[PDB]
Amino acid sequence: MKKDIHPKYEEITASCSCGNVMKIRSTVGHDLNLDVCSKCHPFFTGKQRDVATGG
């Protein structure tokens, strides 16, 4: 990378409501509150309620 033309990309800690405390590098420059993570998101239950319509 070059010098300071890039934004400040400092390691922070994200935390969602799933109890998933996860530290990451992101150029927010602030600690993070979330709801959905990859762990405990309604993706498979979402697909099930999607298919489960007819009758």
Partner: peptide, 12 residues
């Protein structure tokens, strides 16, 4: 991890 789940009406 965190950007794809924050998509509106995420089906896959």
């Amino acid at each position: 991890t965190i950007a794809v789940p924050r998509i509106r009406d995420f089906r896959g």
